[PDB]
Design a protein around this ligand. Structure first.
Ligand code: ATP
Ligand code: MG
Ligand code: MG
Ligand code: ZN
Lengths: 77, 373, 154, 24, 50, 100, 107, 56
RNA sequence: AAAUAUUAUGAACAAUUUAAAAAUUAAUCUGUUUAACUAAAAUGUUAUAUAUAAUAAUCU
RNA sequence: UCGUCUACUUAUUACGUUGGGUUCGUUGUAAAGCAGAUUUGUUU
């Protein structure tokens, strides 16, 4: 199994799972992402981490993910 | 089977956390930047209960790294920072000599015991007090609290599925009694109720329970305190209990305040014990050896002396099978009633104790004021 | 054999025995090593107090804590002032917020230990967890618990 | 109220001056 | 031989690089290497000859 | 009696009478709050890999020759501050890559 | 003495693995009274039926008993094992079954 | 004593010989039944007191 | 800013920090006294008990 | 968290005798757990 897990869509929530732990936390889930966060499953060195990133096409640094968007460079027809 | 877990100090636990690579590092990206730790963990681990997540986070098994060279332990209410890591142990992390909290691993019920109609009827009859959090039952004489070495014997641990009136899970016994001791037994209905009531049954300084006993002979003092030090050693088919007046490293103390309420002249006595500790056969040993008055029917401590011929008009001293005259009478609870007093549950005296009291002319049902409400 | 001398004040840094005690990641269930009290107090307990300005006819007893935020600014659901006086002198009881319910005692403040902060607190406001009076909370921890939403957890 | 949680409380002497009547 | 264990940093593990000494080790005999730190010069000299 | 022992005359901190060559200084913030060096700016942020920090190709080959891939926590913090041309105090324990 | 009393209690209240051997058992006397005394029968609104296949046909029709004594050496009925039936099953001896009913079919 | 029979056997194995002290009027009542039940290889010297009061 | 006199009033952890505890289970600390008379003068503690609520009927 | 455990087995027969060999388990917890104490009436 690969060591880098990419973001995946959140699983469908059941009744109790969608129900918050407290009635005051009902507004906490107002703005939430529909996809999970990327993860690394072990302890590795920097060359191994870079090779895993290149093989999985998934960056680990949130700063790099934010600064390098996947956008089309051509103008829309 | 949990047979691979070892006692670990905080230093060893931190060292194992540092060494073990069975960790997952969730990167806090822009989409989860600013969320709460409990929210993040609940969204990322649907198979974990909130109790499990709370225990992990508060005990420090789940932590976070803010690129500072050190680990950061947080509360469930702390917000996540951008471009940090959340370190969570994996399944393989708990396969080493480090035991996880109760919620991490998954237990299997397996078999389910069947209770008959008469068994359920008597289980409902034994109920004394019921609450949203606790159930106090009247365990009788001769009924084991737990399954003994012989698995064919009935027990309160086996009758337990009969006291889940409306709950989904059966209650949990908060304290165990001897096979011969009869009286009030506390069963927590909720897991949180059990965790909160466990504090009430550890060694204390103020007693919250009474033991009414009929001892053979009257002690030299009407009231006082008893303190022994018990050492338990494994024997052939039993336990060797060594009682000492001085403490030892392998010993544990047993303390109880006794009061002689009423008595015959020098042949029998009615004594109320108020214990402060929880030791095996505590009351029986302290009556037989400290007070030098064996409990009526206590054949294990002072066998021939526990069946006196003075009560031969009432009890035949030749059968040697009469029930032990020791009864867990009254117990205080942390829950209050509508009047503002702590709820004190009282159990009626058994048949043999009521018979002895009536033959000696003593009132059976009397409130013991030494344990307030 | 060989004897040396090291003061216990050098080892006091290692007094906490767990993550919960060293970093305060949860409620201090009567296991707290380091305490922070106001400079000058000799009786080491925290004080959540109320201001009395009038008779029970004009100013009600729960209105003393109006300067505090939270449920003390609402009128309670239960009132035990009329009729037989409570044994523990509980005058009012607010609505249950999850597993916590706020009570107001009568007389001088009773000094108890909040299991969330771990401090001895002297106040008339006691929050009981799951109707079990062994686990009590000061009003400050009660307001903080409700604010975060941990009412059903702690 | 000017009380607060951390701030300690004191017992102020009740103002017993003669007050003007409110007006519609 | 050097008993090198993987150094454990947060989410980073590596192995120790060879020693940066101006005299490379060329003899490998059976035994553990050690330094005996003494006080003063005379004690170092004496233990050397003992 | 209220106290029978004796209190030390060290008003600054523990071991105020000794010389710095013998005793080590406290690093707790309650003590470093008045220190002229440790009360000032302190760099704690780190850089994960050597590729994230700017290095010339000759320095890349020197690291490969020395067989060094992942930076140690002191190198993750001190390399960037020195490349910014600032007076730096590289403080680290023994055997953590303080030389490089 | 305590072991004797505990075994007698486990015989009185039917426990797992308990085979009734004493004819003075309360349920055995209940069955004997239902068989013999008509006033007890009319007061309890109960009746005693014999025959494995007869009980099977009654279950098919929709009638199930509340106590099913099975003589030791016979199998438990599949309809009694089924979940929809709430009939308690009891193990009795040969002479106990003879006392409960002179000609016992085993059930 | 049937519970500590095993501890007594271990102590006998550890010792080189055994020295029993009994009362001649109640020889077997005073003697330890564990030593009578267990066959031990260490020789034992028994000392019966009050032999002049006991039966010849 | 000089020339002179004195100086022992005494804190342990945690978090953050080449920027801000903003983690409220966190405080970041030197208190406190200080007022010519006559006038003038701008300052604050009220409660709202029903709208994801409350009061009610039919029927499956 | 006050559980329970002076009898089994290799043989011998008779309606008890004689030779050998010798624990199980409920629940909670992974610390919020583990030794000992938990006392105070200038009634002098
Ligand atoms: N990033 C790295 N990865 C692996 N090994 C390293 C790394 N950096 C340095 N080392 C190794 O660590 C060893 C010790 O380095 P260094 O001399 O800097 O330690 P030091 O802290 O100066 O020790 P001292 O204070 O005792 O002089 C060197 O031999 C080097 O090979
Ligand atoms: Mg100057
Ligand atoms: Mg203890
Ligand atoms: Zn609190």
């Amino acid at each position: 199994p690969p060591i880098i897990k990419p973001p995946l869509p959140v699983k469908v929530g059941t009744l109790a799972s969608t129900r918050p732990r407290s009635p005051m936390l009902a507004d906490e889930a107002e703005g939430r992402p529909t996809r999970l966060a990327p993860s690394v499953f072990g302890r590795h060195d920097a060359p191994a981490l870079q090779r895993a990133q290149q093989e999985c096409n998934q960056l680990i640094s949130a700063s790099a993910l934010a600064r390098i968007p996947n956008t089309s460079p051509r103008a829309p027809e | 089977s949990h047979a691979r877990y070892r006692p670990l100090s905080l230093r060893a636990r931190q060292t194992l956390s540092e060494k073990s690579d069975d960790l997952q590092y969730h990167v806090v990206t822009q989409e989860w930047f600013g969320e709460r730790v409990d929210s993040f963990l609940t969204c990322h681990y649907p198979q974990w209960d909130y109790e499990t997540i709370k225990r992990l986070v508060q005990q420090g098994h789940i932590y976070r790294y803010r690129k500072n060279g050190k680990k950061k332990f947080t509360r469930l209410t702390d917000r996540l920072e951008f471009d940090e890591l959340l370190v969570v142990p994996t399944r393989a992390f708990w396969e080493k000599q480090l035991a996880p909290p109760s919620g991490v691993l998954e237990e299997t019920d397996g078999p389910k015991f069947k209770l008959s109609a008469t068994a359920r009827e008597m289980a409902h009859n034994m109920v004394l007090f019921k609450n949203e959090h606790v159930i106090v039952i009247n365990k009788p004489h001769g009924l084991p609290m737990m399954p003994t070495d012989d698995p064919q014997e009935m027990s309160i641990a086996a009758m337990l599925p009969a006291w889940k009136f409306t709950n989904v899970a059966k209650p949990v016994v908060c304290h165990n009694l001897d096979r011969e001791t009869s009286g009030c037994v506390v069963l927590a209905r909720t897991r949180n109720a059990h965790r909160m009531l466990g504090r009430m049954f550890v060694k204390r300084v103020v007693p919250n329970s009474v033991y009414w006993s009929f001892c053979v002979g009257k002690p030299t003092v009407n009231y006082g305190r008893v303190r022994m030090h018990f050492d338990i050693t494994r024997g052939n088919k039993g336990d060797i209990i060594v009682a000492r007046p001085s403490p030892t490293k392998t010993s544990k103390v047993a303390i109880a305040e006794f009061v002689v309420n009423a008595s015959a002249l020098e042949f029998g006595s009615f004594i109320s014990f108020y214990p402060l500790t929880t030791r095996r056969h505590q009351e029986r040993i302290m009556a037989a050896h400290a007070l030098r008055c064996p409990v009526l029917g206590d054949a294990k401590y002072g066998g021939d002396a526990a069946f006196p011929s003075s009560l031969s008009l009432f009890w035949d001293p030749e059968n040697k099978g009469l029930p032990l005259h020791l009864h867990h009478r009254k117990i205080q609870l942390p829950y209050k009633n509508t009047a503002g007093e702590f709820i004190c549950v009282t159990a009626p005296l058994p048949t043999q104790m009521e018979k002895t009291f009536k033959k000696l002319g003593w009132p059976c049902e009397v409130d013991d004021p030494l344990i307030p409400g | 054999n060989i004897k040396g001398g090291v003061g216990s004040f050098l080892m006091r840094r290692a007094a906490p025995k767990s993550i919960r005690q060293k970093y305060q990641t949860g409620p201090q269930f009567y296991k707290r090593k380091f305490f922070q009290f106001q400079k000058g107090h000799h009786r080491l307990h925290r004080r959540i107090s109320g201001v009395q300005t009038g008779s029970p006819t004009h100013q009600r007893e729960y209105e003393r804590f109006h300067h505090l935020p939270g449920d003390v600014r609402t009128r309670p659901q239960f009132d035990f002032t009329f009729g037989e006086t409570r044994a523990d002198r509980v005058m009012f009881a607010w609505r249950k917020r999850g597993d916590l319910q706020l009570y107001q005692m009568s007389g001088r403040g009773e000094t108890f230990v909040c299991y969330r902060c771990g401090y001895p607190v002297r106040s008339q406001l006691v929050a009981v967890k799951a109707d079990n009076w062994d686990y009590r909370m000061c009003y400050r921890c009660y307001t903080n618990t409700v604010h975060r939403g941990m009412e059903n957890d702690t | 109220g000017f009380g607060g949680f951390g701030m300690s409380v004191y017992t102020p002497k009740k103002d017993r001056r003669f007050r003007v009547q409110p007006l519609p | 031989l050097e008993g090198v264990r993987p150094v454990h940093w947060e989410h980073l593990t590596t192995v120790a690089a060879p020693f940066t000494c101006h005299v490379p080790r060329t003899v490998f005999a059976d035994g553990k290497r050690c330094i005996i730190f003494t006080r003063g010069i005379d004690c170092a000299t004496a233990v050397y000859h003992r | 009696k209220a106290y029978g022992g004796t209190f030390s005359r060290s008003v600054g901190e523990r071991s105020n009478h000794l010389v710095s060559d013998v005793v080590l200084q406290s690093l707790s913030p309650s003590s470093t709050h008045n220190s002229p060096l440790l009360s000032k700016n302190i760099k704690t942020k780190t850089v994960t890999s050597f590729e994230d920090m700017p290095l010339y190709p000759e320095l890349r080959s020197a690291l490969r020759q020395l067989r060094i891939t992942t930076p140690s926590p002191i190198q993750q913090s001190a390399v960037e501050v020195i490349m910014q041309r600032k007076d730096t105090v590289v403080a680290a324990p023994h055997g953590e890559g303080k030389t490089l | 003495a305590q072991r004797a009393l505990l075994m007698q209690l486990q015989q009185n209240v039917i426990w797992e693995g308990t085979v009734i051997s004493d004819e003075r058992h309360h349920l055995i006397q209940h069955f004997v009274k239902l068989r013999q005394n008509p006033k007890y029968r009319s007061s309890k609104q109960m009746m005693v039926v014999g025959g494995r296949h007869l009980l099977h046909e009654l279950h098919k029709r929709g009638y199930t008993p509340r106590h099913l004594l099975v003589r030791e050496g016979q199998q438990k009925p599949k309809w009694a094992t089924n979940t929809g039936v709430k009939t308690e099953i009891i193990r009795v001896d040969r002479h106990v079954a003879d006392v409960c009913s002179p000609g016992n079919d085993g059930f | 004593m049937q519970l500590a029979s095993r501890t007594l056997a271990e102590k006998v194995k550890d010792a080189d010989f055994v020295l029993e002290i009994r009362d001649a009027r109640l020889p077997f009542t005073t003697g330890n039944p564990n030593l009578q039940k267990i066959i031990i290889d260490r020789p034992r010297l028994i000392v019966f007191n009050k032999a002049e009061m006991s039966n010849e």
